Amino acid sequence: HSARKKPLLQNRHKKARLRFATAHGDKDRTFWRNVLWSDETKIELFGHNDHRYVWRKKGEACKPKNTIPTVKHGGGSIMLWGCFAAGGTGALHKIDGIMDAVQYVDILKQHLKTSVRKLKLGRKWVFQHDNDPKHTSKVVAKWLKDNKVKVLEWPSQSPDLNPIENLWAELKKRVRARRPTNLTQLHQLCQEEWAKIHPNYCGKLVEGYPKRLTQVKQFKGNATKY
Amino acid sequence: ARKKPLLQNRHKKARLRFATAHGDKDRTFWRNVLWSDETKIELFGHNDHRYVWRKKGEACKPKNTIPTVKHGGGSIMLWGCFAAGGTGALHKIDGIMDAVQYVDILKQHLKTSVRKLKLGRKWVFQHDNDPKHTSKVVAKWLKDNKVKVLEWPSQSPDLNPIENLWAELKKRVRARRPTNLTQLHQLCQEEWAKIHPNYCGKLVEGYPKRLTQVKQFKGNATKY
Numbered sequence: 002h003s004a005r006k007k008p009l010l011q012n013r014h015k016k017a018r019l020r021f022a023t024a025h026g027d028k029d030r031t032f033w034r035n036v037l038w039s040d041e042t043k044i045e046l047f048g049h050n051d052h053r054y055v056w057r058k059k060g061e062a063c064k065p066k067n068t069i070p071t072v073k074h075g076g077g078s079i080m081l082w083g084c085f086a087a088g089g090t091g092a093l094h095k096i097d098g099i100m101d102a103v104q105y106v107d108i109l110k111q112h113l114k115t116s117v118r119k120l121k122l123g124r125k126w127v128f129q130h131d132n133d134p135k136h137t138s139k140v141v142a143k144w145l146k147d148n149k150v151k152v153l154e155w156p157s158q159s160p161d162l163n164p165i166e167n168l169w170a171e172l173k174k175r176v177r178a179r180r181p182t183n184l185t186q187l188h189q190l191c192q193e194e195w196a197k198i199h200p201n202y203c204g205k206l207v208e209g210y211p212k213r214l215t216q217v218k219q220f221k222g223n224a225t226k227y
Numbered sequence: 228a229r230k231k232p233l234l235q236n237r238h239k240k241a242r243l244r245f246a247t248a249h250g251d252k253d254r255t256f257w258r259n260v261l262w263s264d265e266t267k268i269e270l271f272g273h274n275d276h277r278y279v280w281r282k283k284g285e286a287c288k289p290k291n292t293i294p295t296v297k298h299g300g301g302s303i304m305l306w307g308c309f310a311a312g313g314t315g316a317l318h319k320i321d322g323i324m325d326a327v328q329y330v331d332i333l334k335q336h337l338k339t340s341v342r343k344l345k346l347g348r349k350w351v352f353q354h355d356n357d358p359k360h361t362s363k364v365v366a367k368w369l370k371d372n373k374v375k376v377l378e379w380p381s382q383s384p385d386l387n388p389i390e391n392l393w394a395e396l397k398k399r400v401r402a403r404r405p406t407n408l409t410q411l412h413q414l415c416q417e418e419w420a421k422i423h424p425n426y427c428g429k430l431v432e433g434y435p436k437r438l439t440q441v442k443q444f445k446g447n448a449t450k451y
Contacts, residue, residue, distance in 0.1 A: 059343070060314060060343065061313075061420060062417070062420040090285070091284070119283045119284055179403045180403055180417075196278075
């Protein structure tokens with residue numbers, strides 16, 4: 002008991018997380034390698050606590066002497082939809098404005114089966130997406146059914162169980178290091194760096210996956226470290 | 228126990244003369260030298276293992292590559308200068324620089340840089356022994372415009388701290404992974420702006436140690 006790890010941070014939907022984690026606790030490695038994970042993310046050009054050079058004066062790039070903390074600088078941002086599996090990155094798509102169900106269907110049309118083929122996933126491959134209500138809207142459910150897509154069981158409020166959240170941090174690190182100064186550049190750097198992310202990086206994310214399910218069970222469905 | 232040089236320099240006599248003749252100079256002297264040189268920055272460095280193409284969405288390096296001294300991305304050629312107090316002008320050279328383009332670059336940028344860097348009245352200009360620098364026209368421009376030129380030993384880039392500054396600019400620009408020459412040029416000017424006086428000053432503060440090593444090594448090649 003004392004020697005067990007006890008969670009300090011609660012998660013909602015702990016019973017659903019236990020149903021997911023216990024039932025997938027003995028799935029084999031091939032199965033996890035053939036899950037196509039997916040999510041959206043937002044990348045800011047000027048990160049809210051990135052100490053960037055803001056102006057040039059007398060030939061020197063300058064950072065401000067005095068700043069007030071903020072949650073959001075100017076400079077704008079890009080929103081992205083992406084997918085990946087253990088074997089590598091799938092499609093990356095810039096999303097414009099708020100995404101609705103019809104727009105989500107169009108994203109899947111284009112990019113889902115092309116990604117699966119490019120990644121050479123096996124015949125029993127499974128698609129993962131989160132529990133946004135748009136994902137079971139009539140038009141989306143019909144597209145998934147008509148295109149024979151198998152959808153992974155999924156608990157709500159569980160980004161610590163989707164390794165794509167690690168992949169986005171890798172993309173952000175690569176993009177940030179190229180020091181973009183405008184949004185056309187931010188877009189092109191996101192696509193270029195996504196294309197460079199190593200297949201072995203992706204593989205290492207998925208290799209670690211069953212340990213996440215072990216920790217969800219140990220923590221009775223509360224928040225994991227991941 | 229003494230350090231003994233493993234690599235010879237053909238111009239050890241002149242190097243040893245330079246170090247002897249300058250080894251007593253105060254730090255003020257080195258802070259008032261305006262160092263200068265040109266450098267070429269390749270878009271696709273000859274042994275940079277860059278991704279060359281995309282196929283099936285994946286960026287790819289070739290399965291088999293033969294070494295080369297030069298890839299086909301093109302390059303930018305730059306003239307620059309600096310002193311302990313900071314960067315001077317950075318200028319993109321048009322094609323291949325001849326003596327007239329060199330005089331023109333000096334017009335525009337040399338004394339502007341001395342002004343902006345606030346060098347003392349006895350500032351000195353440094354540049355290497357490229358035959359162009361000794362031409363009737365460059366030598367006459369320097370004399371007419373009252374520029375004092377540092378006496379300079381051949382094959383001695385290890386004694387010009389701007390070669391470190393060029394490597395710093397190249398590191399910064401390469402890390403931004405440019406994919407065309409327009410970007411390469413813009414990144415060079417952006418990154419030059421990020422190189423500050425403290426960096427420049429630390430290079431020059433270390434300079435007497437270079438002269439110490441030239442003397443220890445009897446004019447042969449240093450580590451620098």
